[PDB]
Write an enzyme that holds these catalytic residues in place. Structure first.
Site, PDB file in Angstrom:
ATOM      1  N   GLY A  11       0.832  -1.180   0.000  1.00  0.00           N
ATOM      2  CA  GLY A  11       0.000   0.000   0.000  1.00  0.00           C
ATOM      3  C   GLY A  11       0.880   1.248   0.000  1.00  0.00           C
ATOM      4  N   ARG A  21      13.623   9.005  -4.813  1.00  0.00           N
ATOM      5  CA  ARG A  21      14.438  10.127  -5.178  1.00  0.00           C
ATOM      6  C   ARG A  21      15.853   9.969  -4.620  1.00  0.00           C
ATOM      7  NH1 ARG A  21      15.602  14.988  -2.286  1.00  0.00           N
ATOM      8  NH2 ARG A  21      15.912  16.847  -3.615  1.00  0.00           N
ATOM      9  N   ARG A  25      19.148   9.595  -6.946  1.00  0.00           N
ATOM     10  CA  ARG A  25      20.192  10.614  -6.910  1.00  0.00           C
ATOM     11  C   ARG A  25      21.541  10.156  -6.291  1.00  0.00           C
ATOM     12  NH1 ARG A  25      17.129  16.196  -7.301  1.00  0.00           N
ATOM     13  NH2 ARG A  25      16.109  15.651  -9.314  1.00  0.00           N
ATOM     14  N   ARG A  72      -0.435  -5.503  -6.522  1.00  0.00           N
ATOM     15  CA  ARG A  72      -0.386  -6.768  -5.823  1.00  0.00           C
ATOM     16  C   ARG A  72       0.049  -7.798  -6.836  1.00  0.00           C
ATOM     17  NH1 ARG A  72      -4.415  -7.132  -0.696  1.00  0.00           N
ATOM     18  NH2 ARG A  72      -4.102  -4.899  -0.219  1.00  0.00           N
ATOM     19  N   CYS A  73       0.873  -8.708  -6.376  1.00  0.00           N
ATOM     20  CA  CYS A  73       1.454  -9.738  -7.178  1.00  0.00           C
ATOM     21  C   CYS A  73       1.519 -10.990  -6.300  1.00  0.00           C
ATOM     22  CB  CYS A  73       2.852  -9.313  -7.697  1.00  0.00           C
ATOM     23  SG  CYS A  73       3.487 -10.444  -8.930  1.00  0.00           S
ATOM     24  N   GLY A 102       6.365  -2.692   2.775  1.00  0.00           N
ATOM     25  CA  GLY A 102       6.226  -3.389   4.071  1.00  0.00           C
ATOM     26  C   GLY A 102       6.939  -4.733   4.179  1.00  0.00           C
ATOM     27  N   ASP A 103       6.775  -5.434   5.308  1.00  0.00           N
ATOM     28  CA  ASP A 103       7.426  -6.796   5.456  1.00  0.00           C
ATOM     29  C   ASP A 103       7.034  -7.838   4.415  1.00  0.00           C
ATOM     30  OD1 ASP A 103       6.773  -6.295   8.700  1.00  0.00           O
ATOM     31  OD2 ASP A 103       5.132  -7.170   7.475  1.00  0.00           O
ATOM     32  N   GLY A 104       5.800  -7.776   3.928  1.00  0.00           N
ATOM     33  CA  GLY A 104       5.410  -8.574   2.764  1.00  0.00           C
ATOM     34  C   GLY A 104       6.369  -8.338   1.613  1.00  0.00           C
ATOM     35  N   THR A 127       5.765   2.165   4.941  1.00  0.00           N
ATOM     36  CA  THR A 127       4.427   1.730   5.354  1.00  0.00           C
ATOM     37  C   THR A 127       4.048   2.573   6.599  1.00  0.00           C
ATOM     38  OG1 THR A 127       3.130  -0.036   6.337  1.00  0.00           O
ATOM     39  CG2 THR A 127       5.495  -0.073   6.758  1.00  0.00           C
ATOM     40  N   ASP A 129       2.189   1.728   9.160  1.00  0.00           N
ATOM     41  CA  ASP A 129       1.874   0.838  10.286  1.00  0.00           C
ATOM     42  C   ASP A 129       2.893   0.764  11.381  1.00  0.00           C
ATOM     43  OD1 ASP A 129      -0.247   0.047   8.736  1.00  0.00           O
ATOM     44  OD2 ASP A 129       0.813  -1.771   7.948  1.00  0.00           O
ATOM     45  N   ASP A 131       5.349  -1.389  11.909  1.00  0.00           N
ATOM     46  CA  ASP A 131       5.293  -2.779  12.358  1.00  0.00           C
ATOM     47  C   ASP A 131       6.413  -3.587  11.698  1.00  0.00           C
ATOM     48  OD1 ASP A 131       4.728  -3.207   9.638  1.00  0.00           O
ATOM     49  OD2 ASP A 131       2.674  -3.986   9.943  1.00  0.00           O
ATOM     50  N   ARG A 164     -21.686  13.775  21.407  1.00  0.00           N
ATOM     51  CA  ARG A 164     -21.032  13.602  22.691  1.00  0.00           C
ATOM     52  C   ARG A 164     -19.775  12.710  22.541  1.00  0.00           C
ATOM     53  NH1 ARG A 164     -26.303  11.396  26.149  1.00  0.00           N
ATOM     54  NH2 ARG A 164     -27.464  13.372  26.029  1.00  0.00           N
ATOM     55  N   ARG A 173      -3.060  -1.917  10.649  1.00  0.00           N
ATOM     56  CA  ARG A 173      -3.006  -3.378  10.419  1.00  0.00           C
ATOM     57  C   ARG A 173      -3.035  -4.039  11.814  1.00  0.00           C
ATOM     58  NH1 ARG A 173      -3.777  -4.582   6.016  1.00  0.00           N
ATOM     59  NH2 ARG A 173      -2.980  -2.522   5.426  1.00  0.00           N
ATOM     60  N   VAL A 252      -7.176   7.625   2.865  1.00  0.00           N
ATOM     61  CA  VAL A 252      -6.633   8.947   2.994  1.00  0.00           C
ATOM     62  C   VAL A 252      -5.442   8.895   3.959  1.00  0.00           C
ATOM     63  CG1 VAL A 252      -8.222   9.630   4.904  1.00  0.00           C
ATOM     64  CG2 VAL A 252      -7.178  11.401   3.489  1.00  0.00           C
TER      65      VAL A 252
END
Ligand code: ATP
Ligand code: ATP
Lengths: 321, 321
Positions: A11, A21, A25, A72-73, A102-104, A127, A129, A131, A164, A173, A252
């Site tokens: 994500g 970048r 560079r 995604r793959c 991420g760790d994935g 990521t 998260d 994590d 209230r 996650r 968002v």
């Protein structure tokens, strides 16, 4: 270390562009050729690999998301499929791959390193998260945190006089860090996280106090990994009356321009990844641990699966509320 | 530790309110009475000291500046004047004083500790400059950093098509950290700081490149402690043609709502200051060093006067530009 490739996977997180970048560079500064791999691991499979120049990353440090794309793959879990990825890099004489995600995403790089001796792989933690083993913070966490603060401000500014209670579903996650920092930051009375056993009753007694004490605009911040905002609302309504404002903050939280912390962090880690490739290193994730830029083997990242939840900070937040 | 006082001193920094909130709420949680001292050290002198309750700090975590006020009190350098401050606290049975501000502010607390055994003093680092021994970051730095980014965005969004060069004066006092992080964050071609010998010629060759290469919107970020934006502009115009956009960012850099980093940092340090008073400690500044909450004696804060400027990060920024 003549040629390197760089790709973004999983994500979006703010600062992914700043990390690309810095890779690009730094590599060019060191007379290394750099290739952008588009759409994550799908790009490797489809050979959607293009040479980047200095100007390819102009106007990117501030840009949210990822200008290379991500996809995604699932098929990349197959060893035979990875041979195609490896040949497309090898075709081009690429000797180093930097994966931002991420760790994935790191698992894919670990496999590429095991299955091709000739390609060095380095992971950068992009990521929101927070994590990932071996870094205290991930690129995007700071930005996500401030995004939550602004969303909560918008909710409060636009809400009715009857509100209230605001039940606000944050991302994370399986890690409670975002919910905890955001919760403290917005002065939440309750923070619901996977690392603490939720006591719905206790929480309900706390809303009904503020209310009985004629107090408005009480906030429950909920990590998606613990339960949904809706569920939290349904569970509280077993004890007390509520349907105030169940707000699912959603995707968002991944968008928007990175903060300065993320820009700097991304930049240092992107440059360090390139330094590590030139130094001959492989199969490592980079990070910031105790205020030092460090590299950790993917084995340790994925074995010890322990980055402490700060119970003392959780208890401080409650103390402050 | 029955009663404590809290005060804010020196220029505003975002998160001062969040630090006062944490002091007040932690103290009351521990059944300690807490007094707000208004207008900094002038308040101590004028006895502008009032009991705070839990509700006195409602709606403050997000609030910029300082709800207790702050004032300059040069006369507090006099020992005889301090006796009046000490008696006004002692009158009320106050046993602990928390001072939120810069190293100047800490001097006053050090003196109070030397001159009254009965009052324990603890310093909290509220200032945007990042120039206090024994903390890697001060409360306000993160907020200031993001404020600079937003100002630079506004400048660029509103500028003309002729603007080839923006010379932007950042705060910092005598420390280059803000200029460096902001500079990296906005992709500045040049960062002018007191810790690096400025080579005007080199800088001018760099603007005249971008321009010759038909490139717009080049940024020079200048720490006020090195020189003024005006001066930088005058010095560059010895070599090349320029009066593009000399922008003195000014006191707005101290205003605005703290970021989440500042909120959290302020909160942890405010609670820790209270823990330290209850533990019997005195004459210490609190901080975050290598990702740990720590306390440092005022002696060490003011002796070793060494918190490293990161030349490697300065060189990375140039590398990226
Ligand atoms: N075990 C694995 N082996 C090979 N490739 C993987 C593995 N896990 C994930 N990937 C690749 O990584 C991509 C990104 O995965 P994921 O959606 O898990 O994103 P992430 O943000 O990197 O991980 P996490 O959920 O830990 O934050 C996948 O679509 C896939 O191509
Ligand atoms: N040496 C000193 N002895 C006693 N009081 C002092 C001393 N230096 C400063 N103070 C007190 O601290 C107040 C705040 O001082 P200053 O304007 O230096 O703010 P600061 O942000 O705390 O310091 P710095 O410039 O190091 O960031 C002063 O007006 C004064 O009352």
């Amino acid at each position: 270390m003549k040629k390197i490739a760089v790709l973004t996977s999983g994500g979006d997180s703010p600062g992914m562009n700043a990390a690309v970048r810095a890779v690009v560079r730094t590599a060019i500064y060191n007379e290394i050729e750099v290739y952008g791999v588009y759409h994550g691991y799908q790009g490797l499979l489809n050979d959607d690999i293009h040479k980047l120049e200095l100007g390819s990353v102009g106007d990117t440090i501030q840009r949210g998301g990822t200008f290379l794309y991500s996809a995604r793959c699932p098929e990349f879990k197959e060893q035979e499929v990875r041979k195609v990825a490896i040949e497309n890099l090898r075709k081009r004489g690429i000797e180093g791959l930097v994966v931002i995600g991420g760790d994935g995403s790191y698992r894919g790089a670990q496999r590429i390193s095991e299955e091709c001796k000739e390609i060095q792989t380095i992971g950068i933690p992009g990521t929101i998260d927070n994590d990932i083993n071996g870094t205290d913070f991930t690129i995007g966490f700071d930005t996500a945190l401030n995004t939550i603060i602004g969303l909560v401000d918008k909710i409060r500014d636009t809400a009715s006089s009857h509100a209230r209670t605001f039940i606000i579903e944050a991302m994370g996650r399986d890690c409670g860090d975002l919910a905890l920092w955001a919760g403290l930051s917005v002065g939440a009375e309750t923070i619901v996280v996977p690392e603490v056993k939720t006591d719905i009753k206790e929480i309900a007694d706390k809303i009904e106090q503020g209310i009985k004490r004629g107090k408005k605009h009480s906030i429950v911040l909920v990590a998606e990994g613990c339960m949904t905002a809706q569920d939290c609302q349904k569970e509280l309504s077993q004890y007390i009356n509520v349907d105030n404002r169940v707000s699912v903050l959603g995707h968002v939280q991944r968008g928007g321009s990175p903060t300065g912390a993320d820009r700097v962090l991304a930049s240092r880690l992107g440059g360090y990844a390139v330094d590590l490739l030139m130094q001959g290193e492989t199969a490592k994730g980079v990070g910031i641990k105790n205020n030092k830029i460090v590299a950790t083997s993917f084995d340790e990242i994925f074995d010890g699966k322990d980055h402490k939840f700060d119970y003392s900070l959780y208890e401080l937040a409650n103390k402050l509320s």
